[PDB]
Amino acid sequence: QPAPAVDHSEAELRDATDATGNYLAAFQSGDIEAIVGAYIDAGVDGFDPSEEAIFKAFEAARDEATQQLAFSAETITKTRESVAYALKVDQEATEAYLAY
Amino acid sequence: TGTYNNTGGFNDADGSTIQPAPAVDHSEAELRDATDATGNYLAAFQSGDIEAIVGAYIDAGVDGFDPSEEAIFKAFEAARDEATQQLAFSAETITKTRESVAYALKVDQEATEAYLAYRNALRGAATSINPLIDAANAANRTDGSEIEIYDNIFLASDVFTDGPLLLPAYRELVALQTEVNEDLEWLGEFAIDNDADNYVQRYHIPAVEALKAEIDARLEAIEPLRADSAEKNRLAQKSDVLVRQLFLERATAQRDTLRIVEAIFATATRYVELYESDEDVNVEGKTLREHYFALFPTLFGAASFNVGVLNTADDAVIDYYLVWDTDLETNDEDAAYAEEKREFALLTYAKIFINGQWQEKVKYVQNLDDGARAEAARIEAERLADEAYRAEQLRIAQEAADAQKAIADALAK
Amino acid sequence: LDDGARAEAARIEAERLADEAYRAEQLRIAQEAADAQKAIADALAK
Amino acid sequence: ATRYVELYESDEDVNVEGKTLREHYFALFPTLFGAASFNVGVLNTADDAV
């Protein structure tokens, strides 16, 4: 993926990264109870113990993880463009200072 | 597609497909009876004694005991069919219990909504009434003997609490209305103006009339909400959701045990059936009938674990049918149902990775079986097809050659 | 392993259907050709 | 986990290498539970640095 020098503010980077870091708090904690409580849906008020509902819940969790991965993919390009702009600006600044 | 052996995925004959659960009231006595109708079947199996098991689940037969293998096979087949039917019934028990739970949740949800609405109406009436009471009290010049000094409403039952009692407040409001109507009539007397120390002025009557009008306007709107709150709070007291959750857990454990019971009976039936049979092919350096015999040691531990779970599931229901710690502080609470549902869901999730250990072995042996049985037909089918094709080809070629000889003889003439 | 098994459990069916269609077409063509030969036989024998 | 649950009593659960297809999926968890531990150990420092 290309990375043109486009200024994305560091606050934007922090917000976009924290939007994903909240998803991983339960996983990073390591407790299985927290994981099953957060990433798995309980379902209907009457808990169905059949395997089909379990399969559906796991499929939904997998789809949610896939979408989160898709967003974390674009976060990389955003940050790379920000870095390129941050390099270009002070390169030009130091060139001008040397000339003066 | 559904049988004791199937290749169609999830089956409703075992309790694995999806089923709706509308809020329908099935009484807890019905749950207890339907669960005990199955728990009697498992007493011999849960005891663990082999003699009791063979005495209960296996039929002796004719008075003259036939020791031939065919009678043994028939008895095992009958036991397997009985276990299959018991599993089919334990399947529907689950849906019954789930519907009962849904109804038990709906009723007290509505009850607590009505209670909140009625309490809010009472709070609004309390907010609206007091300033007029103070205004009417300020404009009194009598001695205070017959027309007494009013007191602030709800002196004992604090309505501003979240969950207080609400009947004494209504009775106090009714008593205040009665007192106002009583004291209003003495304002129409002719000798009430006794002396300077006690008499009436011009502005007392309008204040009393305004207070009475406000009370009469508030009660007319208060009444239906009180009626609905009482009616809905009485109905929600006739159903508990915790015992239904316990029954659901017990029935799930019963179905889990019935699964392995049916598996054991089917394994024994198939092992007995393959005695000196043409279909007893040899694979993986062993005979097909040998493979079935190795399943028992793992089943005898998986069933032990399932029975250990079912024993606690059974003991829980008997000790907590109607006693405290099953009904709680107030008519509607989800702080206890949520925790039990979480624990039950966690246990259900955890157990799906344990029964699969023996399920996969059973599937492996069964797969070997039907693979051999189905593969020992395609050679015959293809042989018949090839023979028919060759015969038809030869017949067509011969008749074409005859036709060529026919035209030869015809135009040669 | 998974997709190999899943994809391999279709080629036998595909080839069986293709072979059955090929054999049926071959037999039909042979039979109609034999009928045409009988037709010319009856025609020029008349 | 989804695929392991899906293959319950299924027609596509063929047997290979002396084991069932559903059995093969179950053996992946012990290695993932260590690889994810390493990745989480890296991510913890990556988060604390910012």
Residue numbers in the entry:
A (entry chain F): 51 to 150
B (entry chain E): 33 to 445
C (entry chain F): 400 to 445
D (entry chain F): 300 to 349
Lines quoted from the article behind this entry:
Corynebacteria belong to the bacterial family Mycobacteriaceae, which is characterized by a highly unusual cell envelope with an outer membrane consisting of mycolic acids, called mycomembrane. The C. glutamicum MM is further coated with an S-layer made of the PS2 protein, which adds another level of complexity to this unusual cell envelope that is incompletely understood at the ultrastructural and molecular levels. Our structure shows that the S-layer of C. glutamicum is composed of a hexagonal array of the PS2 protein, which interacts directly with the mycomembrane via an anchoring segment containing a coiled-coil motif. PS2 is an SLP composed entirely of α-helices, an unusual feature among prokaryotic S-layers.
The resulting data was used to obtain a cryo-EM reconstruction at 3.1 Å global resolution, which allowed us to build an atomic model of the C. glutamicum PS2 S-layer. Amino acid residues 33–445 could be reliably modeled into the cryo-EM map, which was sufficient to visualize the S-layer lattice contacts. The missing N-terminal residues of PS2 (residues 1–32) are predicted to form a signal peptide for Sec-dependent secretion and are presumably cleaved off and not present in the mature SLP that forms the S-layer lattice. At the other end of the PS2 protein sequence, the missing C-terminal residues (446–498) were previously shown to be important for cell envelope anchoring and are also predicted by bioinformatic analyses to form an anchoring segment on cells. Due to detergent (SDS) treatment during S-layer purification, this anchoring segment was likely detached from the MM and remained too flexible to be resolved in our cryo-EM analysis. The PS2 monomers assemble into tight hexamers within the lattice, which in turn are linked to each other through prominent trimeric interfaces that are repeated throughout the lattice. The hexameric linkages are primarily established by residues 90–110 and 300–445, located around the center of the hexamer and in the coiled-coil MM-anchoring segment. Each hexameric unit is connected to neighboring hexamers through trimeric interfaces, mainly involving residues 194–204 and 213–235. Both the trimeric and hexameric interfaces are formed by a combination of hydrophilic and hydrophobic interactions, including salt bridges and π-stacking of aromatic side chains. The combination of hexameric and trimeric interfaces results in varying pores sizes of 6, 27, and 81 Å within the lattice.
